[PDB]
Symmetry: D2
Subunit: 406 residues, 4 copies
């Protein structure tokens, strides 16, 4: 089983989760509690699930990504007492039903991936809301949705946004999301990136990482944006900025990373050159309008696994990766094992934080406590065998005084 | 044209934001009747900031951030332009302080401070300044830390805007901003190879990271020291090696301090350095590298080169210090690229105008630069570069604010 | 379309030079009446090279470079196109050799070799091949070394063109050519973080340098091992750390061999590796990392992942090997980018045409690819990209050839 | 004296020359011989001169770069018995006379920098040719001139081209010439390079290093060439290639590194944008036609030290660095100390090689012997405390055999 092998592989390179398991498996702090999860299911996230289980939690999972009927990772999890609900295709109806099945187990805590499970809890299953003590949300898209929910006054449980900690800087780095995205694009196209015009839509944490990686690969990077401050940063970073309607005319690759909808229009698409490659790095598959592609294409064909060709009225053919879905997850390895280990440790401690403090907390979206960022950093340094400096007594006094040393 | 005027002429063709600001307020002269007191590194770029404020109607009174960094020809050019200048390049500390007092004796309405010196003096020794001071714009992290400490003791009386910490400090402290100017200063004064050398950067905040990223771009083996676990992990994830300074000094070819702290190197650390090691400070005050310690423990002290002091030690080894432990990119370099300072200065002018407009509704505390100023300056920059960007549609606006 | 045909379809839209060559010789069919025997990694890109030669009139007979790397659907697609294919993906060594013999039994006029195997067999065991063989085009450094050794013994009988060593090996072995395909193969099969890890690259010739440069671009701490002082100094000047392999293995997270030599890791070196170390070979033959040694000294051997073998040792530590010590970018990756292979293959077609035209005036020795072929292919590439360059004037030509 | 200080500074960071002096100063192998040199004179080259003197040679120097009348380095050299002829301005007449003065001393060996001293020896001072036993030429331009001289059959002494060894790769590297060039441009302009269009004319060893450094600084690099192979390499390296007449229309910086003449034409110059900066990295000041600039400029003014402004008929103003002369030497530090140490060790051993073998050698241009490259590399590793691997007996047999291991 590649799946059991992959879980064993992953476990060997997730030192933080291993440390957490070794530290708390005997005390089992989550014993008697149920953690529900909506996540992209594969070996890495399976290990998060397993760690929570070792800590005593009853884990209930729903995988958003379609899985083969005898998926090795799902089976490994089930053999450990972990419940796993999956779907076979991108059928929204089944996806909704699977979310409901997780809620049917009345989770005490939820680890959400985009805010779906939380939102549906507040709009369709209020009975579950009463037992729900807290939510840990991973993505920028999910946090945005939940902050908007809080805005209306409808939010009824504490939410910890793990997304915006001191270390989202690690997750979206050029070595985090940046490289995983380009690895998925290159492995599925075998095309040379050096010298090519790469358009990246959005220059936030995700897009910047993707743009920096492309440049490091020799690409000529072009950035599109709606925020002047971000555009200027791209320019200062050495990239070219222009409107998308202009960028598409010269694009060899177009990568969306905005977290917005319809970043490409029909007109935009009809400007692309024959052979152009499109991919989405945002959370939902609405950035590149796949429905529009389907509708205006004279013909659609499979060019390679994970790559769809679309010939248009202008006779040109453009290619889409992973049907416009999160390319690094849907057609790649997601993020490096050690990067997920870091993200997962933050999420596990967030859940423990909610367990210890949900009553004291209010039904609003909280930033991840600083103490958690520092605890994970200290553990990471320990696992690396790295030592750093400490402040001296004189330095402590210097830093808090306004008077001059002299 | 005199050399001072020539330096200013050069700079003015590459400062589009300041030029746009002058044109935009040429008629209105918003600062007419107001005195802006300044304490900054006096060179052509800062002189252009002073000239622009003067064009907006302000009476500008300026002094150097350190007498040593003051360029006399630029000062003389500013004087011929009607600007009041209290600053002469000098080693005399008493004269320096005296010049800060002269600026305060002009009772400025607003102060553009560099290190918090004018503001601290105003709240402790020269409170008469408080009869007319309405707000302060502070440029450096060190200044902000000092003013927050002043606030904490309850002595602060006017609002302070930290232009420092903004959405555009990612530009000032960029590898292409502070990073490159720091390395240009080091390379021009040592002519030493950077590729393959062990470069120790103390501190991994904005300044140190830019410095470390540039060193790596030059081929160095970068080692970062820190006291904050989160920053240390950040450096490791950026690809750098992290270890305690006491271990780093044993293999260092270069040690650059960028912490904003004092005594980053101990006497013991110094005695562990190898012969020929080069030390430089990129932090605001000359306390990061203990210059007094080097002086005391050295058997011999000599000029090895212009801007480079050699200290031969009890262990027979000699180590070298650039610019007497002072801010290296400014004391032995060009500061920052012109276009980078143009942006920073546009932000400072709008900070002063923002104080002029809202100081009465602000408490005596440190305020982060308002977001609308960042956006305003960014749009001016895009306009100046002739760059067009996209605009959200109604569907997109609805999408972004929806939770479904 | 069948999957083999689909793979070839994809590749053909991104191979402009091969497409230009087909169009350029469509009528002439210069290779009509000639058989070109091939031994190469059988995938879509090499299949397109075969198809292009067929379009120039050649009877093409091809076999895999290693049965394991042969893609059966691509092979079947080639057969449906009239090309003779002797190659089935297999672990059986005897069947592999048998397939090389079948290619030789077609008595090729020209051979495109990969590692010198066909050529060596032709000059030692199957000399009947020499009744019709007129020239060989060898792609790899290892092949060239072997054929030069064959030449040295006096057994070589036909001219050999080393397409390898040319003005455009700087492209094939570029950080964007071999470098990135090597790392994509390693990252896709381990999903391990590269930034901050110790990456040991054994050998600093063209291949190793590209690999080291890409590793550094990914944030790795790169360590290079070498036996040639000039190459070691080169690595140091490029910014890398250099040390003996016996010291490098103690801290290595990754060890990549790119030397073209045998036993780059000793048993002692292997027992010094840390638990979890990852080993991969980018050299032509699977002898760089001693696979037989790992097998013999291992207490446990298991599949850790697809393309990854785990070997638990007597010291209780486990080390991992990618693709059984075989050429990693080919055995567990996509080889090289399409456009890179298009260039390499254009050079090989012109090498064969050059042999067709000049083999009688060439000795049985290894010849570097003729410079005019490099220029011809470069012009075709510029034309294809629609790039225009400058042209020397009469004054400039006179200047360049003048000594005054 | 900054000059004596600078010589002392340089000596501390030139481990190879120090090793050479320590090794041979007692034997003084060059005792009784005269080494004439035509070089750019500053602290670093002074140290080459001093090392030869410590080895026993009578050194006679002529500095091509104008020097102040009481130049500290020249005075330091004279106080050591080294003869130094200098000029005060860019007066060709005085430059020629200084070359003659070096020849007047009848050197046994010549270290040339551009081929001038050697060429004039073969066309005006044949009496000196008889005693001249060999020449070591440093630059690409000088080697080209001397190879052309050999071509006519006029060459009468052995010439070792140090330029084309295994290590010209170190001298022209992005960290060698590349960075020194950009440091001179940035220190003399204070302009931001990130985002700017940088045109580099010529993609040989020098230009490539300059282009790679510019990209590393965030520039958008544009390359011009006359050799298709080089153009393609630039493209594969991720840069844009186009004709100069087109490149100049968008250039913020134009750097010539071709070793050719008139890389910019009047028409080209009139296409430059207001504020454009021009600099030459080639050996002779003919790449950017300064005479043409002087002639067509409505007015010429000093903008900054080392920077001349030229306002043209189209009302635009363009700026030239160091009067179109080798920018990194004429307005910068040349090359890093350790890089020159390497180049100088190669040149010292070349002179010793000529001393030992000039009779056996023929009057042609020789490549630097491989043994010298390897000797300097071994010494460099030794000074760095670096150890490498050695071939095993099995490996030696493997490498020379055509048979398969299996
Ligand atoms: N593939 C992956 O592994 C990852 C995916 N993401 C997803 O990527 C998206 C963005 O992530 P972040 O960068 O953290 O959000 P962000 O807010 O930091 O960056 C979003 C940027 O997109 C720009 N933008 C919005 N609409 C645009 C449009 N129509 N055209 C051009 N630019 C536009 C915004 O101005 C903003 O600067 C989210 O959906 C997030 O969940 C985030 C991290 C990793
Ligand atoms: N040279 C220049 O042009 C510039 C200078 N600066 C100056 O550099 C200093 C830092 O600026 P920022 O990075 O914005 O401050 P910062 O607070 O953002 O980063 C400072 C870092 O130093 C670390 N640190 C403190 N003490 C340390 C020690 N003893 N050893 C190692 N690390 C230590 C802290 O943990 C922190 O991460 C200030 O003095 C600032 O005024 C800032 C920007 C540009
Ligand atoms: N994976 C791929 O796609 C490619 C593979 N190759 C293969 O890689 C190998 C080398 O290719 P090249 O770089 O062109 O050969 P090369 O001769 O140009 O460089 C080989 C280097 O390895 C060094 N070396 C030899 N034995 C060593 C040892 N025991 N330890 C450390 N260093 C050692 C040599 O001193 C030499 O500098 C060959 O097998 C070649 O066929 C070449 C190009 C691409
Ligand atoms: N500033 C410095 O420190 C250094 C200066 N140089 C000087 O730079 C020049 C070139 O050095 P190399 O790169 O070693 O010679 P090179 O022969 O390796 O490169 C010269 C390149 O310029 C191209 N070229 C010729 N004419 C051209 C034109 N009109 N337009 C565009 N491209 C053209 C050629 O095709 C060739 O690729 C020589 O004068 C050399 O002495 C060399 C090394 C360092
Ligand atoms: Na299964
Ligand atoms: Na620890
Ligand atoms: Na107030
Ligand atoms: Na022949
Ligand atoms: Na003097
Ligand atoms: Na040694």
């Amino acid at each position: 089983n590649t799946g059991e092998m992959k879980i064993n592989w992953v476990s060997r390179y997730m030192p933080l989760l291993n440390k957490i398991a070794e530290e708390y498996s005997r005390e089992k702090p989550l014993s008697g509690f149920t953690v529900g999860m909506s996540i992209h299911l594969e070996a890495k996230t399976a290990y998060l699930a397993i760690t929570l289980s070792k800590l005593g939690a009853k884990v209930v999972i729903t995988g958003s990504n379609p899985l083969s009927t005898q998926d090795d990772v799902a089976e490994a999890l089930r053999s450990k007492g972990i419940t796993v609900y999956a779907r076979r295709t991108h059928d929204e109806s089944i996806y909704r039903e699977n979310l409901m099945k997780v809620l049917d187990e009345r989770p005490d805590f939820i680890i959400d991936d985009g805010g779906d499970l939380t939102v549906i809890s507040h709009t369709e299953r209020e009975e579950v809301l009463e037992n729900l003590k807290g939510v840990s949300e991973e993505t920028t898209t999910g946090v945005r949705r939940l902050k908007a929910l809080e805005e209306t006054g409808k939010l009824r449980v504490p939410v910890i946004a793990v997304n915006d900690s001191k270390m989202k800087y690690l997750f979206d780095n050029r070595y985090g999301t940046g490289q995983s995205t380009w690895d998925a694009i290159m492995r599925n196209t075998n095309l040379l990136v050096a010298g090519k015009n790469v358009v990246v839509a959005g220059y936030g944490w995700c897009g910047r990482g993707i743009a920096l990686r492309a440049a490091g690969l020799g690409a000529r990077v072009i950035v599109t944006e709606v925020d002047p401050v971000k555009a200027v940063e791209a320019i200062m970073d050495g990239f070219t900025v222009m409107p998308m309607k202009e960028a598409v005319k010269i694009a060899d690759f177009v990568i969306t990373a905005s977290g917005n909808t319809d970043v490409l229009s029909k007109e935009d698409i009809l400007s692309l050159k024959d052979g152009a490659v499109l991919a989405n790095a945002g959370h939902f598959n609405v950035e590149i309008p796949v429905r529009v592609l389907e509708e205006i294409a004279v013909e659609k064909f499979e060019a390679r696994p994970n790559v769809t060709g679309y010939t248009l009225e202008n006779g040109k053919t453009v290619f889409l990766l992973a049907e416009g879905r999160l390319v690094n997850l849907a057609a790649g390895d997601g993020h490096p094992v050690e990067i997920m280990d870091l993200s997962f440790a933050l999420q596990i401690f967030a859940v423990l934080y909610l367990l210890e403090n949900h009553r004291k907390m209010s039904p609003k979206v909280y930033m991840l406590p600083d103490e958690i960022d520092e605890r994970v950093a200290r553990m990471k340094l320990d696992s690396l065998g790295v030592k750093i400096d400490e402040l001296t007594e004189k330095q402590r006094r210097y830093l808090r005084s306004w008077q001059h040393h002299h």
